[PDB]
Design a protein that fits this description.
The complex is a heterotrimer of chains A (123), B (208) and C (1011).
Chain A lengths: L5 E15 L4 E15 L5 E6 L6 E6 L15 E9 L6 E8 L3 H18 L2
Antiparallel strand pairs in A: 1-2, 1-6, 2-3, 3-4, 5-6
Chain B lengths: L1 E8 L5 H9 L13 E10 L2 E10 L18 E7 L3 H5 L1 H11 L5 E6 L15 H5 L2 E4 L10 H11 L30 H7 L10
Parallel strand pairs in B: 1-3, 1-4, 4-5, 5-6
Antiparallel strand pairs in B: 2-3
Chain C lengths: L14 H13 L2 H15 L8 H7 L3 H17 L6 H20 L1 H6 L1 H18 L7 H8 L4 H20 L7 H28 L3 H14 L6 H4 L3 H11 L1 H15 L8 H22 L6 H7 L4 H19 L1 H4 L5 H14 L5 H20 L8 H13 L9 E3 L2 E3 L5 H20 L1 H16 L6 H13 L6 H21 L5 H15 L1 H5 L2 H14 L5 H18 L1 H4 L9 H7 L1 H4 L5 H15 L5 H11 L1 H15 L8 H21 L4 H29 L7 H23 L3 H21 L9 H13 L4 H19 L7 H17 L2 H4 L3 H15 L4 H21 L3 H23 L7 H16 L16 H16 L5 H13 L4 H14 L14
Antiparallel strand pairs in C: 1-2
Helix pairs in contact in C: 1-2, 3-4, 4-7, 5-7, 7-9, 9-10, 9-11, 11-14, 13-14, 13-15, 14-17, 17-19, 17-20, 19-21, 20-22, 21-22, 21-23, 22-23, 23-24, 23-25, 24-26, 25-26, 26-29, 28-29, 29-33, 33-34, 33-36, 35-36, 36-38, 37-38, 37-39, 38-40, 39-40, 39-41, 40-42, 41-42, 42-45, 44-45, 45-46, 45-47, ...
Classes of the chains: A mainly beta (123), B alpha/beta (208), C mainly alpha (1011).
The structure holds phosphoaminophosphonic acid-guanylate ester (GNP) and magnesium ion.
Magnesium ion binds next to helix 1 of chain B.
PDB class: protein transport
Keywords: Nuclear export, protein transport
Assembly: trimeric
């Protein structure tokens, strides 16, 4: 499973989108628990998200300190950001992600946690 | 360990959307009729190792049928799709089954009633009985709400492997690389990003 | 690569190259597979590809290539057979027949190329459907003769006969004309006597498996239609029920034949046939008991192990026992020597009813419903099945599924996100049988439930599953006990369930028992009515659950509140003995404390429950006061946000103010839903201000779209503002749909509503128009459309042309607008047709264009209304009589409606509306042949009748749209279609015959004389 050398920092239900710049539209990528996992050895935190029933990975990347969360025009409960190395679907790809939550409260809490975890990887 | 799966049913029943949901996780709202067949590989992780389904998503529209029953040759399992909001698609289930078992005489077959997420349901659960005499497994599914969307493949994997205790397991999570952004294009990580930022997310009225 | 060379037909077909393209498609992957796919389709779709099928069958070393060659022949035989010269038809027949014999006599190819023979047999049957027997009268005799020369040829002849029986009897209704299917039907019935000889001989002597199985598989198809004497006046029943049940390689197909035998309604007066029907059931059950499994076997564990074909056999066994017993169990209930067989058969079903398999349980549950319903009415029967029913009560109670009302489900105990319509239907089916089983013995049912509840108190058998199934079973049998027995019963259950909740602590445990308490009490309102102390304690516990952290417990408490109150509202409005005031007055006062922890949409559910109670009060003054006491908090907040919003009109910028406004109108919608016409005083208190707010919100929406663009419609701010407009329209629509005082609606409500919504809809950009406007007008036209004929005209002018322009460029843009648009045009054309007579002739052309546009939708919500509007429009025009508008209509649109109806009937893309399409075309055709159109429909020699010009028009229209039809095909079809224009069943049959003939060449025009 390759999650035993890791500790869970944050868990929240969410829906993940990837931006198809060609078609200029958001495409769903997965619904499930979004987790912040801090490797106990190297202390770097990653985002790991699995789809609900099949448990396949839809997000797998370090919460790099260079990332910035921006709002999406149509939602007060979502965040948009760019990701240069995500290995959910195999080889490391680049993606513009959007993640939506059940409430603005969960979305603000995620941004708090997302930024706390950035301070961890900046060492 | 790969198995050929043919996917048949009337046009518009949701065959292509159901497969796309399993390949990428997306929900396609447009109806672009499949032309002949589209083969996609689809791998599931089980407690008995990975299993790969070579999914032959055929065309339901007669004018786009392609080779028709020629797609069924050497298939090892099958899914028959119909639309619970369309009585016609269920009256054609015996026809798709007829063409299928004349070529595939002894394979596991799932009967799926799609679009159970729509309030105005036309094919009531009480009238869906065709699978009984034909030894098909039946599932109410929805590629939109993901209701029972994993059970067609879970049942087939249990019949193809021969292990009724087979379960889906979490695929391992390899360590993700540490990479810095590209300042050669980081001045342009603001065009295709502000575009995505101003393209509204779909279905904002959902729970997620 | 260069795989396209096979598509060139000038040069010769490189058979080798073909075999590689085929191998690349089936065995390859990726682009080379897709490249080979498009090439094979184009090769197959070539009208001349069939001429190369001869050399593919000889010179190809690939079975898949010979398969596709037959797929090419199958297209030719099915569609263009009767156009070939007679020499090509004999050549293809001899070629197919010779190849089949060639593949059967090679013992090795007969084993390894099974499909290629099966595809060949099906192809031969396609020839039989065209040529036999009128041009092949010796096929069956020669087939029977060739059966003895080779055992492989004999087995394959059973496949050809099986496929021939399927195509003629099972799949002919939709693929042949009525005369063709009847012709091929009589042809097989004439020759079946000689087909049964061969089949019976092959079963009586029997070689080994393969030939027997293929014989039985073919017999399974015969049993659909063959006369009964072939089954009972021979010895084949003894062969099926004994010999072929012992060998497991013929056991499955034999069980399916005996199921088909079991499903015929015998001459229920013949003692002999009854004796044979008992006999094959007696033999079959004997073979299962000694050769398969005994009656005590754990079929639940055998099905779960999934060895070999165990699951398929137990499915087939359940189907056999249920089919036979549902039709013939009465043959075993009187004779005492058959009692053990009758009960052993049902005991097998009890064991089959313990299998964990949803769809197999619904099959056996269906039979249990058939049984207990019969025992409930038929005298002297229930005592036979006393032990079967006692076992069945235990099975159903332990396998109860979750009803609708239970919103708590285990993932972890979380809230239900999706309704499970399949689970809900299974629960209702289980409740039906368990209610019957309770009536059959209420003492046994109560003891089973009381004993199980005791072992939840004990903790002896505690679990979430066991407390849920028990609680669900207890609520399902509501109404089956006597009020006295029910009184003692539910007082117990409720007391123990409350004791269970107060005992076990836990976020999950206390939520599971809460949902079980709430389901049981919601199902027993009769008990709650006659015991106020219980009802009050129940209601207060629901209020206690409205403060729990789990939203599902809160959600269910509000829904259980509404469910109890819908039945017991009388006991909340009167002054109860030993009480200070009506309980409604107490609830209204604490309404801020009771709903303090509820989320908005659950607070509105609370208010709707209060409105149910208040509407019980019939004293107008007291009810109007109870209504005011209820609406104080939303009216207080409404008065505030109205004072400082007419002044300070920007204030509507605040997102938090938008949420407050929407929830206020949502609370007014909730109360108006339950009270209906009794809501008028509260509606009048806010109506004139609400419509101004609608105007105020409307201007900001248009302001944001101008300042930000169309993207503003997606922002949370605008979406929040539009919610206020949607909720206002929903409140107006809700009241007008339930209003009894239509005079106040017309004189007070209609004129400020149309002023506030109509031009705002017409003058907003398309992306800003709320489809709920159209939905609101439909209710207005439906309920008071006959009193505002000038209001209906105004409604049309504001919405008709601009909405039609949004939805006439494709079939998918603005989906909610299409549905409400045609719902609006339907009710206007129905209850106010005069508004269309007031349309300018150009706007009436768009109205007809809008109707035929709805024909061609595959969306049923639009397609059904479009065919209905056209039907009602024709009736409306006919009612006017012989006036200019009615004659101008038929001149300009009668053939637009006849042709556009024929287009959707024959384009193979609107099969879902065939019935309403046929009904419309029949009405149109009947107009002319009843001389209801008093003008010439042509602008043709004068004096000719509209009956004549209609037949010339339709014959010309069909000759151009279907050029492959002979003139006499079109002549006979229209002739029959005309004679039958008052007989919808035959009319629809002639149409279905026509849709068969337009798919092939050479259809017999005499087929249209079937009636
Ligand atoms: N409401 C709803 N719509 C669905 C669902 N599944 C598919 N659809 C929709 O139905 C339409 C048909 O899509 P599609 O997958 O192409 O069906 P198909 O059977 O592959 N058509 P064809 O056989 O001609 O290729 C799409 O618009 C899709 O969004 C569903 O589960 N719920
Ligand atoms: Mg498709």
């Amino acid at each position: 499973t390759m999650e035993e050398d890791e500790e869970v920092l944050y868990k929240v239900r969410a829906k993940l989108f990837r931006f198809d710049a060609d078609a200029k539209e958001w495409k769903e990528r997965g619904t499930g628990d979004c987790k912040f996992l801090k490797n106990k050895k190297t202390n770097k935190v990653r985002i790991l998200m699995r789809r609900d029933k099949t448990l396949k990975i839809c997000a797998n990347h370090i919460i790099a300190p260079e990332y910035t969360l921006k709002p999406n025009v149509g939602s007060d409960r979502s965040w948009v950001y760019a990701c240069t190395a995500d290995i959910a679907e195999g080889e490391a790809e680049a993606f513009t992600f959007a993640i939506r939550f059940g409430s603005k409260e969960n979305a603000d809490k995620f941004k708090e946690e997302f930024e706390k975890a950035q301070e961890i990887n900046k060492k | 360990v790969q198995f050929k799966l043919v996917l048949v049913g009337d046009g518009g029943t949701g065959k292509t959307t159901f497969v796309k949901r399993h390949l990428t996780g997306e929900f396609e709202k447009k109806y672009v009729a499949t032309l002949g067949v589209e083969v996609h590989p689809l791998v599931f992780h089980t407690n008995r190792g990975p299993i790969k389904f070579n999914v032959w998503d055929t065309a339901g529209q007669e004018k786009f049928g392609g080779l028709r029953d020629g797609y069924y040759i050497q298939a090892q399992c099958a899914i028959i799709m119909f639309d619970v909001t369309s009585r016609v698609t269920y009256k054609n289930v015996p026809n798709w089954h007829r063409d299928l078992v004349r070529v595939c005489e002894n394979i596991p077959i799932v009967l799926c009633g799609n679009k159970v997420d729509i309030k105005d349901r036309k094919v009531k659960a009480k009238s869906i009985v065709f699978h009984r005499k034909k030894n098909l497994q039946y599932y109410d599914i929805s590629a939109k709400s993901n209701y029972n969307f994993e059970k067609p493949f879970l049942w087939l994997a249990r019949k193809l492997i021969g292990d009724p205790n087979l379960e889906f397991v979490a695929m391992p999570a390899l360590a993700p690389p540490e990479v810095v952004m590209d300042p050669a294009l980081a001045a342009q990580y603001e065009h295709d990003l502000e575009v995505a930022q101003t393209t509204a997310l779909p279905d904002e009225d959902d729970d997620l | 690569g260069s795989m396209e060379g096979i598509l060139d037909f000038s040069n010769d077909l490189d058979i080798a190259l073909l075999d590689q393209v085929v191998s690349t498609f089936y065995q390859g992957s990726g682009v080379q597979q897709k490249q080979a796919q498009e090439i094979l389709t184009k090769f197959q779709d070539n009208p001349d590809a069939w001429q190369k099928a001869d050399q593919i069958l000889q010179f190809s070393t690939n079975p898949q290539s010979k398969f596709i060659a037959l797929s090419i022949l199958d297209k030719l035989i099915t569609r263009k057979w009767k156009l070939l010269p007679n020499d090509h038809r004999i050549g293809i027949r001899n070629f197919v027949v010779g190849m089949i014999i060639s593949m059967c006599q090679d013992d090795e190819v007969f084993k390894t190329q099974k499909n290629l023979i099966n595809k060949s047999d099906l192809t031969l049957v396609q020839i039989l459907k065209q040529e036999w027997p009128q041009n092949w009268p010796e096929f069956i005799p020669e087939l029977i003769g060739s059966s003895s020369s080779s055992v492989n040829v004999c087995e394959n002849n059973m496949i050809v006969l099986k496929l021939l029986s399927e195509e003629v009897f099972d799949f002919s209704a939709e693929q042949m004309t009525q005369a063709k299917a009847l012709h091929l039907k009589n042809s097989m019935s004439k020759e079946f006597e000689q087909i049964f000889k061969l089949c019976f001989q092959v079963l009586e002597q029997g070689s080994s498996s393969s030939l027997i199985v293929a014989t039985l598989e073919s017999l399974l198809r015969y049993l659909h239609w063959i006369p009964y004497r072939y089954i009972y006046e021979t010895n084949i029943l003894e062969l099926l029920s004994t010999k072929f049940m012992t060998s497991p390689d013929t056991r499955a197909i034999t069980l399916k034949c005996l199921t088909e035998v079991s499903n015929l309604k015998i001459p229920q007066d013949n003692d002999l046939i009854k004796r044979q029907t008992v006999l094959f059931f007696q033999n079959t059950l004997q073979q299962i008991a000694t050769s398969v499994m005994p009656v005590t076997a754990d079929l639940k564990a055998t099905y779960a192990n999934a060895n070999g074909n165990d699951q398929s056999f137990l499915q087939d066994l359940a189907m056999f026992l249920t089919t036979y017993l549902a039709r013939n169990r009465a043959l075993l209930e009187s004779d005492e020597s058959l009692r053990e067989l009758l009960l052993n058969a049902h005991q097998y079903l009890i064991q089959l009813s313990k299998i964990e398999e949803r769809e197999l349980f619904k099959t056996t549950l269906d039979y249990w419903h058939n049984l207990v319903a019969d025992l409930f009415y038929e005298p002297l029967k229930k005592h036979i099945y006393e032990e079967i029913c006692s076992q069945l009560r235990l099975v159903i109670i332990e396998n109860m599924v979750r009803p609708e009302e239970v919103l708590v489900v285990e993932n972890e105990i979380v809230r239900e996100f999706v309704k499970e319509s399949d689970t809900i239907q299974l629960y209702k089916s289980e409740r039906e049988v368990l209610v019957y089983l309770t009536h059959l013995n209420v003492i046994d049912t109560e003891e089973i439930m009381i004993s199980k509840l005791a072992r939840q108190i004990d903790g002896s058998e505690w679990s979430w599953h066991n407390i849920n199934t028990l609680s669900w079973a207890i609520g399902s049998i509501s109404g089956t006990m006597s009020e006295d027995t029910e009184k003692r019963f539910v007082v117990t259950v409720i007391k123990d369930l409350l004791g269970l909740c107060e005992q076990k602590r836990g976020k999950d445990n206390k939520a599971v028992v809460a949902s079980d308490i709430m389901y049981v009490v919601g199902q027993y309102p009769r008990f709650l009515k006659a015991h106020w102390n219980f009802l009050r304690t129940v209601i207060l516990k629901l209020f206690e659950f409205m403060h729990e952290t789990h939203e599902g417990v809160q959600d269910m408490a509000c829904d259980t509140f509404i469910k109890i109150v819908q039945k017991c509202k009388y006991h909340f409005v009167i002054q109860q003995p030993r009480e200070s005031e009506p309980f409604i007055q107490t609830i209204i006062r604490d309404i801020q404390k009771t709903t303090a922890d509820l989320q908005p949409q659950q607070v509105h559910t609370f208010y709707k429950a209060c409105g149910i109670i208040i509407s019980e009060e019939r004293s107008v003054a007291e009810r109007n006061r109870l209504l005011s006491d209820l609406m104080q908090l939303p009216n207080m907040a409404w008065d505030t946000i109205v004072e400082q919003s007419t002044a300070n009109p920007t204030l509507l910028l605040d997102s938090e103010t938008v949420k407050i406004i929407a929830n206020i109108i949502k609370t007014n919608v909730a109360v108006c839903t339950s009270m209906g016409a009794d809501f008028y005083p509260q509606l009048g208190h806010i109506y004139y201000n609400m419509l101004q707010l609608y105007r105020a919100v409307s201007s900001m929406i248009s302001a944001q779209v101008a300042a930000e663009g169309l993207i503003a419609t997606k922002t949370p701010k605008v979406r929040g503002l539009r919610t206020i407009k949607k909720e206002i329209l929903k409140l107006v629509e809700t009241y007008i749909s339930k209003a009894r005082n239509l005079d106040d609606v017309v004189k007070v409500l209609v004129e400020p509503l149309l002023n506030a919504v109509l031009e705002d809809y017409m003058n907003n950009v398309p992306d800003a128009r709320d489809a709920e406007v159209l939905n609101c007008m439909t209710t207005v036209v439906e309920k008071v459309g006959h009193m505002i004929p000038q209001g209906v005209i105004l409604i049309l002018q504001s919405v008709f042309e601009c909405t039609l322009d949004m939805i006439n460029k494709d079939f998918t843009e603005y989906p909610e607008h299409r549905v409400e648009f045609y719902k609006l045009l339907k009710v206007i054309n129905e209850k106010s047709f005069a508004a269309f007579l007031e349309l300018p002739p150009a706007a009436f052309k768009l109205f007809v264009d809008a109707i035929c546009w709805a024909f061609k939708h595959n969306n049923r919500d639009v397609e059904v209304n479009g065919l209905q509007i056209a039907l009602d429009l024709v009736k409306n025009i006919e009612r006017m009589g012989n006036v200019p508008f009615a004659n101008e209509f038929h001149k300009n649109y009668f053939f637009i409606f006849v042709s556009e109806t024929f287009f959707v009937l024959t384009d193979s893309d609107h099969k879902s509306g065939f019935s309403k399409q046929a009904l419309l075309l029949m009405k149109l055709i009947s107009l002319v042949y009843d001389n209801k159109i008093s003008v010439p429909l042509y602008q043709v020699p004068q004096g000719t009748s509209n009956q004549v010009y209609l037949s010339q028009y339709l014959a010309n229209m069909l000759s151009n749209a279907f050029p492959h039809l002979t003139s006499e095909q079109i002549a006979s079809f229209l002739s029959a279609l005309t004679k039958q224009c008052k007989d919808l069943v035959v009319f629809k049959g002639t149409l279905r015959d026509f849709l068969v003939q337009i798919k092939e060449v050479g259809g017999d025009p005499t087929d249209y004389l079937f009636a």
